[PDB]
Fold this sequence. Notes:
binds manganese (II) ion, FBPase_class-1 (chains A, B, C, D), binds ligand PFE, eight-stranded mixed sheet, homotetramer, 7 helices, alpha+beta, Fructose-1,6-Bisphosphatase, Chain A, domain 1, globular, 319 residues, D-Maltodextrin-Binding Protein, domain 2, five-stranded mixed sheet
Amino acid sequence: NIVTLTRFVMEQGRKARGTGEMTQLLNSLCTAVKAISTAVRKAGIAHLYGIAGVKKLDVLSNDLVINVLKSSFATCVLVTEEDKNAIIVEPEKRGKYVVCFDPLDGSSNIDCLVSIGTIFGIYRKNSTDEPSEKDALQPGRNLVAAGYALYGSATMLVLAMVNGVNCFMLDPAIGEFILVDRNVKIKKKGSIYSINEGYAKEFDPAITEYIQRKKFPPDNSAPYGARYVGSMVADVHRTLVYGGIFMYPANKKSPKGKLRLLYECNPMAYVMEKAGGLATTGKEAVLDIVPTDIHQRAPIILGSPEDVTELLEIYQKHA
Amino acid sequence: NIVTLTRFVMEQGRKARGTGEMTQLLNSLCTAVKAISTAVRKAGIAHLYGIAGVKKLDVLSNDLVINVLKSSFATCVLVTEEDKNAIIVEPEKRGKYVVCFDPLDGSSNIDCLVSIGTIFGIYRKNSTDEPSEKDALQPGRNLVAAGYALYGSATMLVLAMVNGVNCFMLDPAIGEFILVDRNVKIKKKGSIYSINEGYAKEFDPAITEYIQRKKFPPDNSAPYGARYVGSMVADVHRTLVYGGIFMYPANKKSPKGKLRLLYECNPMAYVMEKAGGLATTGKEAVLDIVPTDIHQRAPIILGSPEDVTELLEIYQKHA
Amino acid sequence: NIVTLTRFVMEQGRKARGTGEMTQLLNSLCTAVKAISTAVRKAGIAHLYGIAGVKKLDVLSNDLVINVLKSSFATCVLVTEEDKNAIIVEPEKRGKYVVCFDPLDGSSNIDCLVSIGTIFGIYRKNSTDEPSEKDALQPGRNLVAAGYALYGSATMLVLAMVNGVNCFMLDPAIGEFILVDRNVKIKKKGSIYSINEGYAKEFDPAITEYIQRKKFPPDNSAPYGARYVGSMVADVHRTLVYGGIFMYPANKKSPKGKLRLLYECNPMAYVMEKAGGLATTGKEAVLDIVPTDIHQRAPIILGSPEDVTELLEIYQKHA
Amino acid sequence: NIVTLTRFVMEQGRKARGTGEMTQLLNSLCTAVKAISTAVRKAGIAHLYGIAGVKKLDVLSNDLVINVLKSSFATCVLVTEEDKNAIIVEPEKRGKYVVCFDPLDGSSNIDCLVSIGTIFGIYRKNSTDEPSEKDALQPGRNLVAAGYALYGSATMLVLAMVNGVNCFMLDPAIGEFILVDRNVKIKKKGSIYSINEGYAKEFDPAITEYIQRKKFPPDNSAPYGARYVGSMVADVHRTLVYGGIFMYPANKKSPKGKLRLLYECNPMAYVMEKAGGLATTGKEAVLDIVPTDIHQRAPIILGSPEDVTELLEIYQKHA
Ligand SMILES: CCOc1cc2ncnc(Nc3cccc(-c4csc(CO)n4)c3)c2cc1OCC
Ligand SMILES: CCOc1cc2ncnc(Nc3cccc(-c4csc(CO)n4)c3)c2cc1OCC
Ligand SMILES: CCOc1cc2ncnc(Nc3cccc(-c4csc(CO)n4)c3)c2cc1OCC
Ligand SMILES: CCOc1cc2ncnc(Nc3cccc(-c4csc(CO)n4)c3)c2cc1OCC
Ligand SMILES: Nc1ncnc2c1ncn2[C@@H]1O[C@H](COP(=O)(O)O)[C@@H](O)[C@H]1O
Ligand SMILES: Nc1ncnc2c1ncn2[C@@H]1O[C@H](COP(=O)(O)O)[C@@H](O)[C@H]1O
Ligand SMILES: Nc1ncnc2c1ncn2[C@@H]1O[C@H](COP(=O)(O)O)[C@@H](O)[C@H]1O
Ligand SMILES: Nc1ncnc2c1ncn2[C@@H]1O[C@H](COP(=O)(O)O)[C@@H](O)[C@H]1O
Ligand SMILES: O=P(O)(O)OC[C@H]1O[C@](O)(CO)[C@@H](O)[C@@H]1O
Ligand SMILES: O=P(O)(O)OC[C@H]1O[C@](O)(CO)[C@@H](O)[C@@H]1O
Ligand SMILES: O=P(O)(O)OC[C@H]1O[C@](O)(CO)[C@@H](O)[C@@H]1O
Ligand SMILES: O=P(O)(O)OC[C@H]1O[C@](O)(CO)[C@@H](O)[C@@H]1O
Ligand SMILES: [Mn+2]
Ligand SMILES: [Mn+2]
Ligand SMILES: [Mn+2]
Ligand SMILES: [Mn+2]
């Protein structure tokens, strides 16, 4: 098209007078995403089933991300959903960026072929001391870039930076992401709510009340439709493009929520705020949480500002 | 691999002593599904965005299916979700099969990139008179073959015939569907329920009671998880592979349900029963309904037999 | 398109009242050619160079062909350029066909990326005794089908059978070979000659005289252009589509020529004669040679009939 | 792999302290090459043959190159084999580079599917006046970068810059060119000669003598093999990787040779000299010719230094 992601990032880098390190990191991430997307779509699966006479997909996707990021020479600390500790990049390959990611979000949808994706959040190292896990413990408000690749009906890379959110469709015939939605903004009010209602017995009173309103509107408006793919990248992408609200609040399993702060909640909250939406725990903005553990969890409610504000008012009412 | 769908259908045709007409119909459908899959995944999208200086996807998918089926020389009547009247195949291209299909199920999810699919049902012409719409008005029990292609994280073709259900993964590197799950059988009891709960105000008492039991099990077992992608092919495929129950019952917009009998409900009911599951409207088996309109709708409840039976027992209790 | 190779072979099998065994053999060969093509074009090469942290191409191609042919259940004896002995198919996988092939012709051009291909010849088993090498020792005149797949700028499968030659272009986006040139016939006279002139010191007097006439036409016409890719499949395909003559005559390293009779010369001679061309050793028709060794060589001159006849007349003049 | 072309060029740009303009130009060219390669391999050809119910390849390839180069914002003048005049880029899209290219070299091999390719040469604008055709008239010695993409058995991008030549294989599964041959150097002496011998009656005495030596070596060494694909990119690539010599000297058609100086001869001479080889007209170095017309032709002899020197000595002998 007129605009490839490669051209977009290179132009954004030149406008920012970057040294080329962040541009290289973003180019490396795009490469990883294409390698993951091809594996996810099962190109070459015949070679595993004996056509000429292994690693799980999530593990392979982690290896792709890690390898491609270390070889960018732009990173110093990596936090992955798959690794118990932060990965400290070798001194020879060290750059200034800290990346938190989930290489293959929705991995429990993997076997039923439901949409899955990769989520990432990028920070600039904060201190001058040896890179360590604490470099990945900055609040989401410090993000320099975040987004996700969705391996859905087609593969799309959504990238959010200071000035906004842009969506790029992967054209797998030529391995280019094409800019198709510019400076995306979410609708102020949607008509879809997204939550796993199987935890109904464990929900707090405010979530319980809010769902009841979506089904039985007190002003007699049309009830909201319900959608829950069960893969955060897919439900979040729908929320972004169509509007509405996505909820993964606390319950019994965890009064801290299920989703991970560093590489699930923070990245999606950043994309949402850059698109004009909101992302809250129900009590505080996700992006201002000060993380204390790289695998910390957090409740998250995100989406159209009027819908998220309505839920916030209910929590306030109950407080 | 060892088994391509081309080899599988050819061997099944030889074992049945077919003349080759149904084999050719099935080979043509496979070809159409690969062309659809490539368009769905947006291979070549850069050519629509000016890389070198239109039809919607559902329309394109329909043209692919119709053209490829007509050119098989195996059909006489086609019913498509997209066309108001049954298509009567020209005399020169006429064979004995009647095909009912939705070329791109889940079209409302197209723009948010969630999984979408193609659903098909194949019948043998019943009468000796000129082919007409009435040849597509057979109960699903008369199906000779049905299934779907899901364009999800990967593309899979699920084919059900008299002796059972088989799953073939499309390897897009060579354009072959590889047999990956043989003689599939659904779990007797699942732990996921799938329904759009935004219609809660319009549900009948039996659905209402059932959903409440999934959330607050009277036996104190763990509540079922909820999933609702909102694309029938995706929810039904997850139901088949992981077990559980999928529901699209009657509501206010339709006391006859929303999903179409000939090319949504019948094909999915046939796959389910061949896999050892159940498919009911809540009062009668979907496959035994004798349709009177090619675009008739029907309520549908399908999935693991213990789950569907529990819901049928509630209906019976209320009656 | 209107005609896929899958549809073409299935229709040809139905018209011949075949049992489906040769149709299945041809479908399996198509599958093998797509797997080879994808490997030749290096799809997935990044996985050999550490993107996420072996067999030569000719060997891989051979394994693909052998595995796919054995699993067709249509063959009993395979002769490959790569194996010293004929392969005798296990009794359980045995059918009636004998296949001679070069899985990756032009292997010397592999490293410089010039066009390479797969050549095949198919015979019906002749006798009632245990299949053995002798079943592959039939003159090319007994071929039931032959052709090649060229991995050139695009991949094309050329198939010759009793009634003629057809060309099918592989569309790698959907893995279908599309009929693009029907009932192909070679030009009666070309204007290109193809031979390795580095053996000029070893050529017989008739080849020497002929080449001199192409360069200095005694009738003062324009000299023929010269082309010699050095991969038989590529030179022969150009000969078929544009006309002219291809020569690999006897030399010093071999007074019997270099090219192999069973899986290079016979298949190409059969395609040529079905397209209205000629294929001679300079003294007798290639197709009428009764081989005595599966790896026997033969001199070969093939192409437009007026050109080949002019060269045969020189041989006769000298005799 | 470890090294993609995108990473390679970005690192080379940062080492050179470029502003990012040349990096962007090279990234744009890679994008064009992938779009051309997919069209050349005929992905999507089924859509031209009626699968769901035009521009020639050379024209399409020209449109891709021009469009992608103008949108790089890095060029001011473009010279293409397909356009009679130089293209002056619009002031808004103007950068400092001058690009000469043949978008699809070997287009007479197109219909027989022989290897074809794209050749390019990049110059930095020389003067401060309005960009015009004269900006493309610098001797090849001023090139900042040159190379070619070969659409052969696999697609390879060969890029030559001040410090040497590197070869990158296109992995079409992910649209990345992977570095596979680093700092390539041609053999000092080869054993292959490449020339169209159909012009034997029109060759000068030195070429005539040289060919006779390759066939009948006066010191009784083994004669050289002969190869002539008839596509300059293919014959040149073979010469680079295997060694030997490639000749397209003057004759009757033109005592100035056939190949074009600006976008055939200069680029290939630059690649050859950067790889340790030679490229001469027989009388002067190609790279030092001062061009007087954008479509000027020039004789060219190129390849292994010992072989090219031997031919130069023969020309000198004859002078
Ligand atoms: C989830 C992990 O997925 C894979 C792991 C593999 N590990 C190891 N090897 C793999 N592939 C493989 C194995 C043997 C040969 C080839 C092969 C040979 S030629 C060729 C053409 O690209 N591919 C590929 C894998 C493929 C995977 O996914 C296919 C969709
Ligand atoms: C939703 C319908 O989608 C398409 C419709 C098209 N109609 C018309 N033309 C299309 N593509 C197009 C247009 C111009 C040139 C080419 C082209 C030239 S060379 C090439 C290589 O495959 N493709 C393709 C379409 C592509 C579509 O989807 C691509 C992802
Ligand atoms: C010349 C033989 O070529 C190959 C041999 C291979 N053997 C073994 N493995 C191969 N590939 C490979 C290895 C590890 C992982 C994967 C892989 C993982 S996910 C994926 C997606 O297709 N591919 C593939 C091979 C690839 C070849 O060619 C690729 C162009
Ligand atoms: C040599 C020119 O090549 C092409 C020109 C085209 N011009 C115009 N349109 C083209 N393609 C086309 C036309 C209609 C529909 C589509 C299409 C619809 S959906 C889809 C999936 O990518 N592609 C593509 C062309 C394709 C070409 O090459 C195919 C290998
Ligand atoms: N490609 C890019 N896109 C957006 N911002 C960038 C880019 N490159 C650099 N920047 C900005 O400039 C900073 C420093 O760049 P760098 O010198 O490459 O680390 C970044 O951390 C961003 O704030
Ligand atoms: N490929 C096939 N797979 C399964 N059943 C087949 C196949 N081909 C034919 N049959 C059975 O044989 C009947 C008639 O085949 P046909 O002569 O092709 O119409 C079918 O309608 C099926 O009952
Ligand atoms: N697909 C086909 N195309 C052309 N001829 C065929 C085909 N199938 C069968 N035949 C002819 O029928 C004979 C026997 O077929 P079969 O019973 O499959 O072995 C062949 O050996 C050919 O002569
Ligand atoms: N990617 C690159 N690779 C090699 N050299 C480069 C690159 N970018 C810039 N240069 C060198 O630096 C010069 C100026 O770059 P630029 O400012 O982008 O025009 C070039 O003309 C080359 O000499
Ligand atoms: O099954 P549950 O509890 O609804 O959890 C689903 C969530 O878990 C995850 O799979 C974990 O990341 C998310 O993608 C998704 O939103
Ligand atoms: O939006 P609703 O009413 O839940 O309907 C969704 C259903 O409609 C369809 O999109 C139309 O067939 C189905 O794929 C899906 O099951
Ligand atoms: O190098 P030579 O002797 O010209 O032989 C080339 C021939 O050898 C082969 O590579 C081997 O079969 C053929 O494809 C080709 O025609
Ligand atoms: O047919 P001839 O005169 O040998 O010309 C072939 C040459 O012409 C071209 O096709 C023109 O670029 C070159 O690729 C090739 O080297
Ligand atoms: Mn995960
Ligand atoms: Mn549908
Ligand atoms: Mn061969
Ligand atoms: Mn040209």
